[PDB]
Design brief:
This is part of a larger assembly, with 13 protein chains of 13 kinds.
Chain B lengths: L2 H18 L5 H26 L6 H27 L14
Helix pairs in contact in B: 1-2, 2-3
Chain H lengths: L1 H7 L10 H10 L1 H23 L12
Chain M lengths: L2 H19 L4 H19 L5 H32 L10 H15 L7 H8 L2 H9 L3 H9 L6 H17 L7 H19 L5 H24 L4 H5 L1 H4 L1 H15 L7 H13 L4 H26 L4 E2 L3 H5 L9 H9 L13
Classes of the chains: A mainly alpha, B mainly alpha, C mainly alpha, D mainly alpha, E mainly alpha, F mainly alpha, G mainly alpha, H mainly alpha, I mainly alpha, J mainly alpha, K mainly alpha, L alpha/beta.
The complex binds cardiolipin, 1,2-diacyl-SN-glycero-3-phosphocholine, 1,2-Distearoyl-sn-glycerophosphoethanolamine (3PE) (3 copies) and guanosine-5'-triphosphate.
């Protein structure tokens, strides 16, 4: 076929690879960033739910 | 942390050493094993009683009834060893080797 | 001198000898728990304190 | 025909350990 | 790591909101390879039992392809879910953190001083 | 790692006696650990030869530790090049040669010369560049 | 847990006893009910890293 | 077949590291390699020196 | 014929095999409809149709 | 065919295997 | 004295543990262990754990260790290995009487004992909490919750015990 | 179905079927002593399953049509050949004995399998526990090299330990001059040349070894030729024991379920027979073994699993 | 042992491991470990040989000690925090305490000394259960508490696991001891990545599960326990030896076989975590496993070892086993590398 096919097709190949390349570099940075700060959706290590708290009055006022 | 807690913790550690530092009677080894849990049973009671973790008064029995279960296994293996070999020695309990 | 003696001894045979020399002594165990549990006691003792793993 | 293992090769792989010694001799 | 994200209901193989993604097309190349695995099990299945491999128990290996394809298909949707999920909250984060992602300056190669090493 | 910290605190090619003392302490402790293991897994039938076994192992490991202590430090002192990895390489080979002397075999000494000297260079390579073996969880 | 079946089907198996400020028999308190209740509600919906 | 065996396989099993074997191996080994390294290094250390200060001529040298 | 006894798989286990076709056609007809229902629901959810 | 022991071996130190090695090269010991 | 009474009970607990941990005769090791078993109950009793303290007497002193005596009566190595029989056991027993004597003195002088953990050598009585328990014994109400909230533990503990009896006869059946 | 674990769970036991006609009686004796004749009479008069003496092709009898396969394809040994040159360099002697031991060991399993699955007693000639009398005999004159004993024993403990001993053993006591009497009337030229020493050396090993050490775990009744022909006398003697010694009057359904597991798996029962200890008589090199295996494989029926060979007429291969 | 009794014993062992993975309370975690232990011994006792009794005794002593030592880690964490929830614990000594307590159950460090010997004594089927299913429970705790681990302490334990586990493997004749040494080596690979990212710690688990099911049930089908005994299997069933060499190569990690997928991803992760010396050394020691892997492959099918005339009976008969799930096991254990990006499903 014409060289136009290979030229345009390879341009798409470069476009796809570039976006993939920069995303991985972003992914390693974000993964490092949100692991440390922790204010992110994932890496949210488990805690204890506040629902399991007995708010009923106890037998001792000092509670 | 209160001085007594050392006494149980050190009791476990020296009980732990006796369990690992062997001799010639794995019967004696089992004694260190059940003594090992006795300190665990004893110490667990102190924190739970001290901190008034009322529902946690559970586990001293739960830990007991399961540590006691290992005695059933361990002592049963004792007589099994003391039947194919007759005795409870540990140096002779090396038939595996290779 | 080189192809059949030295070049086969420096890289290949030396590594093969070292692996075999230290494959035997790892596998040469006694089968007696007294020594194995003694090794564990060392491992617990050194790991807890000596290499500052706790702190 | 191509060489095939014989009792020499087999006994090389037979025993307690293919890398033996005096300690493992018995 | 998505181990504790907000909303993850446990023991949910395919969460409902994953349905908002393009489902894997029925002849997805990944899927047919999953079907390959089912077939490849079938040929050897007659081999261990010493049967006429290819022409031996057409029912047996036919089920293998069916089972592997479906278990593959649901796996692919779940696999596509996390990658979509991993990219989704990714993007939501960077807009929420502009200061940690500066826009690097736009300089053409003309002004960039890249030293040159001859090969001699 | 305070005992290991002693070696790092002393600047390279400076206060050679301190570096030798720090280095031989590392070797002595390392020899003690392996000797205690060898006593454990391999029974020292009689107690006295048990102290002989751990004596040999500690004496060796101290010798490699000590000899590497001087040769590394004095070479940096003599050549006024602390950053040079070769400083450890000669010391590494020097330590390996001492192992051959303790085992009385040129072949083992030659083998220890190459391997330990190469590793001695590599650890210095890491210290200069910043290589971390037990890296903390980063991502 | 590794597989939080308890959360999925909502049957309480052990978490009734995992902390001391939960429901207790005869509604009698632990030694540090006031403090751990404060810490628990401080560290809810926050994450282990941030709550540290 | 004895000759082929003695010249192909029966060398290393009969080999023993000795100063004669060791020195000859080193002499015929690293020796020539480092010797050529020094020769090529100094030659290249003179070549780039000449062109760097413009003391060499490659007016018609293009297809390098 | 050759083996003097009827070997266990020497006869077609009709109940078992007929099951195998039964599940596989179930396994398939579930898949196509599952693929179908996933498609337009995704289209409807994401706008489209 | 040559099975194993006509294949060459290690140096013959003492004259016993020197004689065996000489026979291995089908020659006498005075010239081996 | 009664100032540091729980200091005492903890001390015999340690020396009782050093007893059997020194690997003496299994009956003698049992004797040393039950001595620790006896004294340990007093430690729990001093904290109000009467029900827990009485149990170890029941199922650990009169429980496990009784059937231990059977295996000792079954083992019966050809000679008693009582403390005088061996010299390492004396060394083990003698040693185990030193460091705990060392650190109590270490803890009694400046109280800043930092073995593994930081530890205070202050009087045992301090860490007690002040407050009435009304009419409900806190220990009793805690254990009685076995059948109120400890439903899940009851099933698993029971099921394992049932599996406990199936294994024991199966291993001991000797095929 | 078989005795698979589902069967035992659903209720398939073993003690229900077996009755007083459940014994592992073995009729045995010296060469050509008419033991096989007496074994048949016991079988007929007791309604008790008979097993003829396991030959080289007994395994061939079990598999396929039962037609004896080629000696090259099954046995690599001939008893007639062993008669011609007992000390042949090819190892025909030990190869004969070891294959014979495997054949009777398979026969022992077939007897137990039928007995446990039917409750009917089994009578067989020369049980595997008595097989040593030949190897002992073949060792006394050097028909086999000394090392053959240890290998034959090594197989024996790793196999015969699990197979428990019979109930009552019938012995046809026959003296050597009598053995030297009939074998002329047999006529086959290979068995004329049997040495009187061999007939002697089986006899004492039979007498001083086989009968006494094995007697403590089953009843032993000795019959000479006259009490061998008296089928009426021997059969009521067999019925007139309590059969107390031996493991058989002690086990329960648990062991029998496990016992029928091992015996039903025809690969397992002789799995330890192919022991990897190498000796010249029994070891076959790779080239010879491979070529024979191809020759075995290209045979009809054996190309695939049973019920899976289209050549013999296995229809519906695509559906089985 | 009665099949109904055997089924129940396995049922509790599975549930005990299941109990560990589903408990948010530290006490229940211990309950699962002990009752799994409580039913593991009788399975090893099914054969009831003196070697098995030695094996079972060894297994119980180390596992009971590790489990009992595990209690203090819970108690000490309780003492300093008053939290029974299985989360990031709050004491370096307690964190250190349990790490070797769980490691002994897995057998990575010198703790690993029980792993080979117990496998040697007990039957092939029991070894399959011990080396595959009994490794999920200790791993489950480590995955949950991975955020609290000291990186130096765990990486070391992983290192000696692959280091010693691979090194001694060169000197094993019995296939059972070879498998255990392989298991210890594979133990290090998952444990090394454990502090960094737990996702491919699991990925290594199911994959490592696949070969060990594949290898052991192949070995059971072969009914062989020694290298020489395995060698003779070429004559009986040459095809099985062919698949085993595929798995042997795959378990060694040569691409594009499945066993390369874990190691490749493991190297990728710690490389992202700036740890680049650590992955390199494990890869170098990976060839150590490959050596005796090749030696078995050389003895099994690549060459053709001598057979015995008594093998001729085996030709006539056939196998009665059903080797359930064997067909799909090896296929899933040898060619799944193209389906690698499916690991995000684990996440
Ligand atoms: C991820 C991807 C990979 C994994 C995919 C998931 C599948 C993994 C397993 C594949 C199959 C493994 C197998 O069987 O190999 C053959 C191998 C050997 O089989 P064999 O040669 O027939 O010998 C087995 C016995 O020795 C024979 O002894 P027997 O003659 O007494 O027969 C007993 C047998 C026969 O079956 C029965 O008797 C049925 C039960 C009857 C009585 C009870 C009825 C009521 C309860 C029914 C419960 C079902 O029953 C059992 O063995 C009981 C266990 C199985 C049923 C219960 C399952 C748990 C509930 O199996 C075993 O050794 C069993 C080990 C235990 C199960 C597998 C454990 C390994 C895998 C763990 C990890 C799994 C993935 C985790 C993620
Ligand atoms: C099996 C028999 C025992 C379990 C079923 C019967 C008891 C149910 C029960 O106690 O449920 C407690 C709870 C439900 O609680 P509940 O509503 O029955 O009682 C609540 C009582 N207070 C308010 C004081 C807390 O359920 C469980 O614990 C279920 C555990 C699993 C059961 C099945 C295992 C398989
Ligand atoms: C991490 C610790 C790993 C411990 C492994 C212990 C078993 C394997 C090592 C062994 O048995 O010996 C190695 C070492 C030296 O042994 P050596 O005195 O040379 O004797 C060899 C011939 N019997 O003897 C040892 O005990 C040293 C082992 C740790 C070396 C660091
Ligand atoms: C920059 C700071 C540091 C500066 C100082 C330099 C480092 C410290 C000193 C050198 C340490 C490494 C050299 C080896 C020391 C141990 C030697 C030893 O154990 O020798 C005894 C023995 C060898 O002899 P053997 O095979 O037993 O034969 C005789 C048998 N009768 O041993 C054996 O048999 C077992 C095999 C050897 C022991 C195992 C390996 C030990 C070394 C591991 C690495 C240590 C690294 C230390 C430094 C970094 C960490 C602090
Ligand atoms: C990644 C790299 C490669 C990794 C794997 C490598 C594996 C082999 C490596 C070497 C192994 C050791 C040396 C060789 C061992 C041979 C083992 C063996 O048993 O060989 C003999 C045996 C005899 O064959 P037999 O079992 O009788 O079966 C014949 C077919 N019925 O032979 C056999 O049992 C083999 C039977 C093979 C049957 C093949 C059937 C193919 C069917 C193809 C169907 C194609 C359909 C295409 C459809 C297109 C349209 C969609
Ligand atoms: N090595 C060996 N040879 C056997 C065995 N059983 C039979 N033979 C041989 O088989 C040949 C003939 O079988 P015998 O049973 O001795 O004699 P027979 O003429 O068949 O008559 P019966 O003794 O009544 O069966 C003799 O050469 C025996 O030595 C056996 O278990 N091992």
């Amino acid at each position: 076929d014409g060289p136009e096919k290979n030229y345009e097709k390879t341009m798409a190949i470069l476009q796809i690879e570039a976006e993939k390349a920069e995303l991985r570099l972003k992914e390693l940075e974000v993964r490092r960033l949100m692991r440390a700060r922790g204010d992110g959706p994932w890496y949210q290590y488990p805690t204890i739910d506040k629902a399991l708290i007995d708010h009923s009055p106890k037998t001792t006022p000092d509670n | 942390m209160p001085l007594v807690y050392m006494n149980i913790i050190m009791a476990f550690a020296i009980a732990l050493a006796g369990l690992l530092m062997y001799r010639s009677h794995l019967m004696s080894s089992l004694l260190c094993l059940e003594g090992m849990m006795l300190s665990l049973f004893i110490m667990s009671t102190l924190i739970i009683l001290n901190t008034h973790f009322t529902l946690a008064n559970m586990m001293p029995i739960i830990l007991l009834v399961f540590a006691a279960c290992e005695a059933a296994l361990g002592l049963s293996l004792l007589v099994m060893v003391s039947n194919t070999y007759g005795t409870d020695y540990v140096q002779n309990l090396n038939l595996l080797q290779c | 001198l080189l192809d059949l003696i030295w070049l086969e001894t420096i890289l290949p045979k030396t590594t093969s000898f070292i692996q075999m020399k230290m494959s035997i002594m790892v596998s040469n165990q006694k089968g007696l728990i007294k020594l194995y549990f003694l090794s564990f006691l060392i491992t617990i003792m050194i790991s807890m304190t000596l290499f500052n793993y706790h702190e | 025909r191509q060489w095939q293992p014989d009792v020499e090769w087999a006994e090389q792989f037979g025993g307690a350990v293919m890398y033996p010694t005096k300690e493992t001799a018995h | 790591m998505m181990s504790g994200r907000p909303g993850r209901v446990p023991l949910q193989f395919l969460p409902n909101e994953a349905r908002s993604l393009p489902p894997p097309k029925l002849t997805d190349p990944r899927l047919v390879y999953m079907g390959f695995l089912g077939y490849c099990s079938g040929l050897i299945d007659n081999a261990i039992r010493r049967r006429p491999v290819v022409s031996a128990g057409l029912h047996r290996q036919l089920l293998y392809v069916t089972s592997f394809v479906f278990f593959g298909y649901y796996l692919l949707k779940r696999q596509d879910y996390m990658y979509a999920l991993r990219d989704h909250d990714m993007f939501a984060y960077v807009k929420s953190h502009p200061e940690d992602f500066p826009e690097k300056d736009k300089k053409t190669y003309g002004e960039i001083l890249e030293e040159f090493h001859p090969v001699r | 790692k305070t005992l290991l910290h002693k070696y790092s605190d002393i600047p390279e090619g400076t206060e050679c006696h301190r570096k030798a003392y720090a280095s031989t302490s590392i070797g002595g402790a390392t020899g003690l650990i392996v000797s205690a293991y060898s006593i454990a897994l391999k029974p020292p039938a009689s107690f006295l030869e048990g102290v002989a076994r751990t004596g040999r192992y500690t004496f060796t490991s101290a010798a490699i530790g000590a000899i590497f202590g001087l040769t590394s430090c004095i070479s940096a002192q003599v050549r006024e090049k602390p950053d040079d990895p070769l400083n450890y390489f000669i010391g590494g080979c020097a330590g390996g040669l001492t192992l051959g002397a303790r085992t009385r075999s040129y072949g083992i000494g030659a083998a220890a010369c190459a391997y330990m000297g190469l590793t001695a260079a590599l650890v210095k390579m890491g210290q200069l560049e910043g290589w971390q073996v037990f890296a903390e969880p980063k991502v | 847990p590794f597989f939080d079946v308890q959360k999925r089907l909502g049957l309480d198996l052990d978490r009734w006893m995992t902390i001391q400020s939960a429901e207790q028999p005869h509604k009698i308190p632990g030694r540090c009910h006031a403090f751990e209740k404060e810490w628990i509600e401080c560290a809810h919906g926050i994450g282990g890293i941030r709550a540290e | 077949i004895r000759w082929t065996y003695a010249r192909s396989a029966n060398i290393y099993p009969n080999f023993r590291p000795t100063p004669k074997t060791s020195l000859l191996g080193a002499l015929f080994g690293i020796g020539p390699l480092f010797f050529w390294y020094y020769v090529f290094k100094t030659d290249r250390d003179k070549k780039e020196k000449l062109i760097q200060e413009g003391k060499l001529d490659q007016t018609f040298n293009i297809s390098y | 014929k050759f083996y003097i006894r009827e070997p266990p798989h020497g006869s077609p286990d009709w109940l078992k095999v007929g099951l195998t076709l039964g599940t596989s056609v179930f396994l398939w007809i579930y898949l196509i409809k599952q693929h179908k229902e996933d498609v337009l629901e995704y289209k409807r959810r994401n706008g489209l149709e | 065919h040559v099975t194993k022991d006509m294949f060459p071996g290690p140096y013959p130190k003492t004259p016993e295997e020197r004689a065996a090695a000489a026979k291995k090269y089908n020659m006498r010991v005075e010239d081996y | 004295m009664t100032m540091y009474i729980a200091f005492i009970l903890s001390t015999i607990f340690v020396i009782g543990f050093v007893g059997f941990s020194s690997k003496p005769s299994p009956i003698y090791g049992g004797l040393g262990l039950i001595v620790s078993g006896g004294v340990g109950c007093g430690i729990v009793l001093n904290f109000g754990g009467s029900f827990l303290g009485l149990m170890v007497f029941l199922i650990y002193l009169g429980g496990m260790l009784v059937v231990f005596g059977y295996t000792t009566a079954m083992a019966t190595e050809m000679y008693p290995e009582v403390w005088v029989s061996n010299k390492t056991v004396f060394g083990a027993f003698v040693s185990g009487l030193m460091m705990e004597f060392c650190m109590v003195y270490y803890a009694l002088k400046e109280e800043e004992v930092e073995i593994i953990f930081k530890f205070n050598g202050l009087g045992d009585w301090v860490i007690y909490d002040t407050g009435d328990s009304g009419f409900f014994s806190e220990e009793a109400m805690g254990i009685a919750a076995l059948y109120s909230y400890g439903t899940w533990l009851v099933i698993v503990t029971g099921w394992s015990l049932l599996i406990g009896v199936v294994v024991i006869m199966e291993i001991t059946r000797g095929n | 179905l078989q005795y698979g674990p589902l069967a035992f769970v659903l209720g398939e036991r073993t003690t229900r079927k077996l009755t007083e006609t459940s014994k592992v009686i073995t009729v045995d004796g010296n060469i050509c002593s008419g033991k096989g004749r007496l074994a048949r009479e016991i079988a007929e008069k007791l309604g008790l399953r008979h097993f003829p003496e396991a030959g080289i092709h007994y395994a061939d009898s079990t598999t396929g049509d039962g037609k004896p396969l080629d000696v090259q394809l099954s046995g690599n040994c001939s008893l007639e050949k062993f008669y011609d040159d007992p000390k042949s360099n090819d190892g025909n002697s030990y190869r004969l004995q070891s294959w014979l031991y495997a054949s009777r060991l398979l026969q022992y399993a077939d007897a137990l399998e039928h007995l446990l699955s039917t409750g009917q007693g089994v009578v067989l000639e020369r049980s595997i526990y008595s097989d040593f009398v030949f190897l002992e005999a073949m060792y006394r004159q050097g028909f086999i090299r000394k090392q053959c004993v240890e290998h034959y024993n090594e197989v024996k403990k790793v196999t015969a330990c699990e197979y428990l001993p019979p109930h009552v053993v019938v012995y046809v006591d026959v003296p050597v001059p009598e053995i030297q009497s009939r074998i002329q009337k047999k006529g086959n030229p290979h068995e004329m040349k049997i040495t009187a020493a061999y007939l002697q050396d089986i006899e004492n090993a039979y007498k001083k070894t086989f009968l006494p050490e094995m007697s403590e775990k089953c009843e032993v009744l000795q019959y000479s030729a006259r009490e061998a022909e008296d089928a009426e006398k021997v059969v009521e003697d067999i019925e007139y024991l309590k059969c107390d010694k031996g493991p058989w009057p002690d086990q329960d359904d648990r062991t029998f379920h496990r016992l029928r597991m091992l015996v039903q798996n025809k690969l397992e029962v002789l799995n330890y027979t192919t022991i990897p200890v190498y000796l010249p008589e029994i070891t076959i090199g790779a080239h010879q073994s491979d070529r024979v295996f191809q020759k075995f494989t290209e045979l009809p029926g054996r190309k695939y699993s049973p019920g899976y060979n289209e050549d013999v007429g296995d229809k519906w291969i695509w559906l089985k | 042992m009665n099949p109904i009794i055997y089924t129940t014993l396995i049922m509790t062992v599975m549930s005990g491991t299941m109990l560990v993975m589903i408990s948010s309370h530290w006490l229940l975690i211990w309950i699962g470990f002990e009752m799994n232990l409580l039913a593991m011994i009788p399975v090893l006792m099914k054969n009831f040989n003196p070697r098995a009794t030695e094996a079972a005794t060894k297994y119980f002593l180390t596992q009971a000690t590790a489990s009992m030592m595990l209690m203090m880690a819970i108690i000490i964490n309780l003492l300093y925090s008053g939290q029974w929830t299985i989360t990031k614990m709050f004491n370096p000594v307690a964190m250190t305490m349990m790490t070797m307590a769980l490691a002994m159950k897995l057998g990575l460090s010198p703790f690993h000394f029980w792993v080979p010997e117990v496998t040697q004594g007990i039957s092939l089927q029991a070894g399959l259960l011990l080396l595959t299913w009994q490794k999920l429970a200790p791993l489950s705790v480590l995955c949950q508490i991975s955020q609290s681990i000291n990186p130096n302490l765990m990486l070391t334990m992983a290192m000696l696991s692959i280091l010693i586990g691979g090194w001694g493997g060169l000197n094993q004749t019995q296939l059972r001891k070879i498998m255990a040494y392989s298991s210890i080596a594979h133990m290090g690979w998952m444990t090394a990545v454990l502090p960094y990212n737990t996702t491919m710690t699991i990925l290594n688990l199911l994959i490592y599960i696949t070969m060990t099911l594949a290898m052991f049930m192949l070995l059971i089908h072969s009914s062989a326990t020694t290298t020489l005994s395995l060698s003779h299997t070429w004559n009986k069933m040459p095809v099985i030896t062919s698949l085993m060499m595929v798995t042997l190569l795959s378990m060694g990690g040569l691409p594009p076989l499945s066993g390369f997928m874990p190691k490749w991803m493991i190297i990728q992760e710690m490389t992202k975590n700036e740890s680049i010396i650590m992955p390199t050394l494990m890869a170098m020691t990976a060839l150590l496993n490959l050596y005796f892997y090749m030696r078995l492959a050389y003895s099994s099918s690549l060459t053709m070892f001598p057979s015995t005339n008594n093998m001729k009976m085996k030709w006539q008969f056939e196998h009665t086993k059903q080797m359930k799930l064997l067909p799909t096991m090896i296929v899933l254990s040898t060619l799944v590398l193209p389906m690698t990006p499916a690991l995000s499903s684990l996440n």
